[PDB]
Structure formats: C-alpha cells, structure tokens
Design a protein around this ligand. Sequence first.
Ligand SMILES: [Ca+2]
Ligand SMILES: [Ca+2]
Length: 314
Amino acid sequence: SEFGHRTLASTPALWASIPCPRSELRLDLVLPSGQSFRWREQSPAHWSGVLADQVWTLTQTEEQLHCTVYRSQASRPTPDELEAVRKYFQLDVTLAQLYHHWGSVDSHFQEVAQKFQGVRLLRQDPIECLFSFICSSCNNIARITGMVERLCQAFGPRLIQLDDVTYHGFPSLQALAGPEVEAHLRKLGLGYRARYVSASARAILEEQGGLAWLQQLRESSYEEAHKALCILPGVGTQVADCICLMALDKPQAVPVDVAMWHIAQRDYSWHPTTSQAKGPSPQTNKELGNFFRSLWGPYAGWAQAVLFSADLRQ
DNA sequence: GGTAGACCTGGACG
DNA sequence: CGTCCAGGTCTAC
Ligand SMILES: [Ca+2]
Ligand SMILES: [Ca+2]
C-alpha cells in the first residue's frame, strides 16, 4: 500500500541497495544497542528512523543493505541520498579488517567476534548525540529511548507521519535553550536530566560560542574534544567519551560504564593497578579506558562497541 | 583530593 | 509491594 511503513516486499520499486555483506553490518546489533536511540523495527527486520533530516526504513539481505526514503512523488532513494546512508554507517571503514586485527591481539575478542559480526559505529550528529547521552545518565536503553522520543516530539520539527507514528527531527540548540524547557521536559519524565539539557543548551549558545564550537571539535584531538565536552553541565567522562566516539570521530575514545567494568573483570581478570579504589571511580575508570586502548589500539572504541553490544544481546 | 549521597523513573523482582 | 537497577554527574566534606 501507499500508506504506513514500507517493506522490501510491499513496495519493490521504492528501494535502492548499497553493497554490504552482513559481516560488515548487522542492523539488529547496531541500531538498538545504545549508540543511537532513534531507530525502531516497525516491521520485522525493517528499521525506521530519521537519517540526515529525512525518515528512512532500512532492511538487509545477504550482501545487500536495502534503503527507502520518505521525503513529492514517492521514488527510490538517489545516489546522493544513498551516500548519506553510507556516511552514517561509516562504510568506508572495513569492519572485517578491524575484527581481524582485534582478534589477533585479543584471544577473548576473537571468541566473541565469531558470534557477533557486523557491529560498527554510527557517525552521529553532535547535537543529537550530546543531548541523547546527557539523558543516558543512570538510565536503561528502553527508558532513554522514551525520553528522547518525547523530547523530539515536543521540541523538534515535524517531518512526516507513517501509520500512527509522527517523526520529528532532533531539536535545535535554540529550541533546547528556550524558556521553561526544563519544566516541560520534567513533565515528559526526564527527571533531573531536564536541567542538564536546558543548562547545556544555554551553556553552548551563551558561553561557548554556539553550534560552531561543538562541530569544530571533530577537527580537534580526542584529548581536546573530551576536555571541552566535560565543560558542559551534565557531561562527565563517560558521556563525553560516548560523544567523542560516536559523533566527534574519535575512534580511540572508550566509554567506560558498569557493563565494561564487568567485562574487564570477568573476561580479562582486570584490576586497577595505579588507582586507589577497587571499584568504579574517576581514577579507575580512566585507568580501565587506557587499558582497552593499549589492548585494542587506535580503534579501541569500536572494539568496545562489539563487546558492549554482544553483552547486551545476552 | 578521593568519595558517600541527592538527584528522577519505569519495568523489574523475592 | 519494598528494594533494585539501568550506557552518571555533581560536589560538599
Ligand atoms: Ca548505573
Ligand atoms: Ca561538567
């Protein structure tokens, strides 16, 4: 039909492909794993969400990643639009080459990698990434997803509606910095996180120089970027690392959360060697981060994603 | 300076 | 149904 979310079978002519073996990408292991919180499997094996300011539905077969876009006459995605998808999934980065390397220097990684191929990093928009992860504080993926959807619904531009779902773009800095935003977000259930969204939005616009200040962090060094980000209210070391890794092109950034701590102890028998505390603390977290970096290398954050995703899936 | 507590909430559990 | 818990951060002491 011409209504509702499309499927590969229902509207054949409206889909376009991008060569992509499942060994290079597994949507089911990437989209709902806590990187981006804006994708939903509206139909089995079909994922819909906003990508580059438009709604898309994605699904894959072996060797093929099928894409369809909802923009005025319905038509298959164009090469340019398709290029946007390629960039979002950073398809130039060869996952098979990275898995090989990680697996050669880390026998445990090699074991896990066998059962969880295709986990890669999405290249996300800084603003959406920053505010989504500010909401990740003491939160679970499902709840975070709820907060984010409600936030975009209330402050983001309306795009299109499919079935009973209305998609919204992520709110702008100006909108998030608006009056009474905190109060409205508190009614949407963000709790104390509402304060940080409002505060960080205003902080960026009225103190750091605006959007430009955030985006240029992509050209800065990880050390630089991570330090700058921690300036913002509600942004600690973990949130800052998520942003560096997922939005600021810092493939060496390694988010250290409770899950990674358990993995370090259980699968590597790791313990702090210079930090005072025995459990998670700013000293030990930093230490654990350096540990994974010295173990996996320049793309340690991407290695972290495979194990984090595999650990979720279990 | 390293570190317990407060700061919000829904889907869980014994 | 009281206590947990999930991609934490902030800061007084
Ligand atoms: Ca936690
Ligand atoms: Ca801060």
